[PDB]
Design a protein around this ligand. Structure first.
Ligand SMILES: CN(C)CCCN1CCc2cccc(N)c2C1
Length: 150
């Protein structure tokens, strides 16, 4: 009964989270997951500012109202070689990664590790934050509020 949350550097407060390293987060679960990080789904404007500070990924994830990939460098296998905030237009499927926005983060690039899930609630799941440098933090808890997500 274990969940890995792979997290990125923050850029202007925006970061990416993958659950178990596979596309597996619903839109409802995304909101709950950000809430557990004392964060919200980013707006498009927040994401554009994060991009301007150096944020890019090669993964689709939820923001407020869209599923996107921030891209700085063109890469053929990431967002069909686009740059900017690439918006997913057509997909059959509902489960992605998520982006999250924490207003209390530093204003530019913050590539320090994430050390807590401050707003997780009591629960039976071993939740492990996994940083890109391998640093891990674990706690027992839960963050999912919708039954359909568990
Ligand atoms: C999911 N694969 C295909 C590539 C996406 C990059 N992942 C790779 C796995 C990983 C592990 C810890 C932290 C982070 N940010 C990441 C990011």
């Amino acid at each position: 009964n274990q969940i890995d949350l792979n997290v990125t550097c923050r850029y202007a407060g925006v970061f990416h989270v993958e659950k178990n390293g596979r596309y597996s987060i619903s839109r409802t679960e995304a909101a709950d997951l950000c809430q557990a990080f004392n964060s919200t789904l980013p707006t498009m404007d927040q994401m554009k500012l994060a991009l301007s500070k150096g944020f890019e990924t090669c993964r689709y994830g939820f923001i407020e109202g869209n599923v996107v990939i921030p891209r700085i460098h063109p890469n053929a296998i990431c967002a069909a070689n686009h740059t900017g905030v690439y918006i997913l237009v057509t997909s059959n499927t509902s489960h992605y990664d998520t982006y999250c926005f924490n207003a209390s983060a530093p204003p530019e690039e913050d590539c320090t590790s994430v050390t807590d899930l401050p707003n997780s609630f009591d629960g039976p799941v071993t939740i492990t934050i996994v940083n890109r440098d391998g640093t891990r933090y674990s706690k027992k808890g839960e963050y999912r509020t919708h039954q359909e997500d568990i």
